[PDB]
């Protein structure tokens, strides 16, 4: 079900790090959009890390006038969900897509996998 | 997963024709560069996206780099997950993605391409 996407995006979102780590399956991972063609896997152990310093390029992000924005999670079945998000100006231009991948088992995340469309 | 299957092994084997009924009429194929946004095409176009596919894969393969695909896993039954690889022909994996197929009514409403980025 949605709600562990959900604890994790509100609880990660308000600098909440640990309960957003606990979110995570002990081997659960996250692998981000970029890794140089293969994306890098983090372990539960390395998450708390990657929030805090994702928070903090966020804020850099807004006081130059782009967003970050996601949509609610599209379930399909009971251990998948697929959260689409944009970039975008302040006024609504979006200047880039990706979707995040939650892979469930048990109501912890066993893989969140991100993917953005690629750029100049 | 049946239509997934059959698209990859029509279109992967030439034949167009069959390879483009896959898709819905309202049906669409999303690239994964187009300027951080995806490239759109609908069922029309897509027959001359496979064939420019193919013919960039046959220069790949000359060159020693393969696409290789993973049978479909299937999340309820409307959505597919491909995940693919480019690798060598040694089996070194240079990049890695993924095809999201929607479903609805035994044809593909969406085919969302997905590749890990470079610097």
């Known amino acids: 079900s949605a709600e562990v996407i959900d604890r994790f995006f509100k609880s990660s979102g308000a600098g909440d790090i640990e309960t957003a780590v606990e979110c995570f399956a002990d081997d659960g991972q996250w692998i981000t959009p970029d890794g140089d063609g293969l994306g890098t896997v983090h372990t539960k152990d390395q998450i708390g890390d990657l929030i805090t310093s994702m928070?903090?390029?966020?804020?850099?992000?807004?006081?130059?006038?782009?967003?970050?924005?996601?949509?609610?999670?599209?379930?399909?079945?009971?251990?998948?969900?697929?959260?689409?998000?944009?970039?975008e100006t302040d006024d609504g231009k979006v200047v880039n897509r990706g979707v995040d991948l939650?892979?469930?088992?048990?109501?912890?995340?066993?893989?969140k996998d991100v993917y953005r469309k690629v750029k100049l």
Do not use: C, H, Q, Y
């Open 55 to 87: 928070n903090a390029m966020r804020e850099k992000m807004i006081a130059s006038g782009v967003d970050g924005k996601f949509e609610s999670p599209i379930m399909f079945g009971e251990n998948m969900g697929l959260v689409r998000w944009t970039v």
């Open 102 to 111: 939650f892979i469930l088992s048990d109501g912890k995340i066993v893989l």
